[PDB]
Design a binder for this molecule. Sequence first.
Ligand SMILES: [Br-]
Ligand SMILES: [Br-]
Ligand SMILES: [Hg+2]
Ligand SMILES: [Hg+2]
Lengths: 327, 327
Amino acid sequence: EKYEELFARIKEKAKLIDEKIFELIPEKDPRVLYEAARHYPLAGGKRVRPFVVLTSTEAVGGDPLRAIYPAVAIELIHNYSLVHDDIMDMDETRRGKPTVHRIWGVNMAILAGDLLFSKAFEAVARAEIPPEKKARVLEVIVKASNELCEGQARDLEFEKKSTVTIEEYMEMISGKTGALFEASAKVGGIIGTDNEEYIKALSSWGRNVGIAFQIWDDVLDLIADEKKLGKPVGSDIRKGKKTLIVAHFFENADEKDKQRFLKIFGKDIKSDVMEAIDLLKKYGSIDYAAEIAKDMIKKANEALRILPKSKARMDLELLAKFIVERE
Amino acid sequence: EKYEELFARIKEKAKLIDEKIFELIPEKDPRVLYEAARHYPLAGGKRVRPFVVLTSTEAVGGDPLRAIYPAVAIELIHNYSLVHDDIMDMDETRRGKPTVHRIWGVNMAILAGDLLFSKAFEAVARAEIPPEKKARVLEVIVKASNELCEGQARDLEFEKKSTVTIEEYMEMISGKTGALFEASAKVGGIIGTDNEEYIKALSSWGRNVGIAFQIWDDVLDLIADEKKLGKPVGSDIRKGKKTLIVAHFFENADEKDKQRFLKIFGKDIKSDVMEAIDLLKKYGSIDYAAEIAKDMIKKANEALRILPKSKARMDLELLAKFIVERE
Ligand SMILES: [Br-]
Ligand SMILES: [Br-]
Ligand SMILES: [Hg+2]
Ligand SMILES: [Hg+2]
């Protein structure tokens, strides 16, 4: 129920963020480029990352209003990563619509991603903050940007091989999703506080939430009911996607199981999909990943303890808790 | 001969620029990503853009040394555009080597371009300049970045059609190549001078040189001797590339000629290539573009008149003059 109100707040902030986003990427020449760029932002994303920005600036000092363009920067960066990643992953349809590359082609999709990335920094420039703050915000966003490319690169290398280790996958996801999430919180703080203890606490919360997010999604993809998930379980198995669940299984399973799993991994199909999920349960792999996600969530909030009590800290605690309780 | 010394200077500055470039993109994890990113920079580009930066800061105030990272930013941006553009243009081999996408694949090439773009801004952040200057440099680079994507987008749309107008092609090239060149000079000034008259003069010189560069290359591609060009003339004709020469021809040629040119445009071949170049000469199209390039060169230098006499202004005048006299 409170989640309903939390989403009420989240959706409330989204409005401010959205006006800024679309004033940066309006319908102008060239349109094909700007509509291609506008496609994902227009899908009506919930703007969780920007929300973490503005909400983080309130858990430390106040006036998230000054963290609007920097929050926009982060949402623009997130969107550009989706466009390019969809090209690489060969993703057919984001949301209930075709992906940017399928509609406008790979070349225009690359350019749209580029435009989106470029405008994240134009958003960073438009920020209204002290030179020292600005300089420190630009540098947080840049380092997260680099980690993001590095995490996606390691993710591409995985394709060159059948198995991965828990350590390999965690180093990859940390930069793919964790980095930008951490940057969201860390940038929120910086904009409203000079308390290095808060920032270190906000950063740790973003890092952990960003990672647990994805891990929980991978978990849901296997054991979430189809009807509700809108689709059958195990599409990540059919995809041969490297998740923490699959890494745990490869680390713990005997040769016989490993080899059978690999036959029916990333290759009627109802039987093979289930036989694969059964192989994973045999070794507690799904449950394992579920626990890791919950622990990171606990550690994240238990790190916000350091900040004062406000409804802003409240939302950050609720969000983190929601991100791991949902189906 | 003086060109030999100019290139001696250019190559002299390249050293400083190169150390900074490779400290930003060193051989680190992940390597496949960082070598893919290092591939074009390692080709030993002459760093003309960065040279314009440091040289421009000397034509106004002095101490180009403080314009090193901002110059690096621009060279990193130029390099990322080459990687992505090569993917789009289906370019087989830059220089005497394979392109990034052919060696590492399209996905890793996209990521390499992304990393290169991200590190341009990490270079911008590392700059050692007053907050006001920094903020104004970041904003010049961002707007040129946006123009660059816009110019490349319009260039992609051209493929959707057989003919283009002189106006269409100039609006496209202006952002593709002109913008970044203008930014190179404009950013040089800003770093060393608060004279808005210099900056407007430097900017105008960069814009014009950047555009004339490309126009002269297209001219050479047709009428430059093969032996010397290292290859036969008219590969742009076989490519069906939209240049100012082709735009002038489509604007001036009669229907009969238009239609024949289109048959043998972007499609033994020695005869068709020559028949196409002959069609262009009939209407003065090649000569036309040559003159436009020379005029822009004259206008560019005649705009540097405003700055004091130094050897820095000297090099900027020589470079502009070289860019249009070479073969
Ligand atoms: Br399990
Ligand atoms: Br001619
Ligand atoms: Hg990336
Ligand atoms: Hg671009």
